Amino acid sequence: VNSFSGYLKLTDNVYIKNADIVEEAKKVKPTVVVNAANVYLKHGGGVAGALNKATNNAMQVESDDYIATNGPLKVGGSCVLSGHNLAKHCLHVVGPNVNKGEDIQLLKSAYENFNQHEVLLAPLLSAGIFGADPIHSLRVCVDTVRTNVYLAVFDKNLYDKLVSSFL
Ligand SMILES: O=C1CC[C@@H](c2cccs2)N1Nc1ncnc2[nH]c(Cl)cc12
Numbered sequence: 001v002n003s004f005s006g007y008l009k010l011t012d013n014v015y016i017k018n019a020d021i022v023e024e025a026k027k028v029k030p031t032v033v034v035n036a037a038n039v040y041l042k043h044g045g046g047v048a049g050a051l052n053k054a055t056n057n058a059m060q061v062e063s064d065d066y067i068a069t070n071g072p073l074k075v076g077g078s079c080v081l082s083g084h085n086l087a088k089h090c091l092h093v094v095g096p097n098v099n100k101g102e103d104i105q106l107l108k109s110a111y112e113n114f115n116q117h118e119v120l121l122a123p124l125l126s127a128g129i130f131g132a133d134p135i136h137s138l139r140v141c142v143d144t145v146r147t148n149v150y151l152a153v154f155d156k157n158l159y160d161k162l163v164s165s166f167l
Helices: 019-027 047-054 059-070 106-116 135-144 156-164
Strands: 012-017 032-036 078-082 089-095 118-124 148-151
Touching: 012 135, 012 156, 019 047, 019 118, 032 047, 047 059, 059 078, 089 106, 106 135, 135 148, 135 156, 148 156
Parallel strands: 012 148, 032 089, 032 118, 118 148
Antiparallel strands: 078 089
């Protein structure tokens, strides 16, 4: 039993809700919140910009130190950093950005990072400003993640479309 509330159950381990991941994180304080990161951990917009703003820029400060030490992430890769006031940990995961020409096959590799964590609150990877089809992202998620994932979808119209078209 965990503290997530109001989710539709898609599969044994994947749950979905129309919710702002920022507000959801602030309420649940999950062990792991997933960020829709880029390789530079520059949290300018989208989910990343929103999560960082909610930390009063502390996520960005921590991230800049991480990059200065380790260099950029790989597309499809991840790193674990602090969750600040939102969660215990933030798993920064880099899905391919279609608006940069990156290979969509790397979306499966990106979701594989979730399997290192028993329970996660997460957005759909590569959706939104990353330019991929969110329906496809949901399919890859369901077919790749085996741990318990609670997906927050900000846009209500998109949420209804994902549910109604889910196989
Ligand atoms: O709903 C969705 C679906 C895909 C993703 C994207 C939208 C546009 C580009 S990628 N997306 N976005 C969010 N998902 C959860 N919480 C959020 N909070 C804010 Cl702010 C935005 C947001």
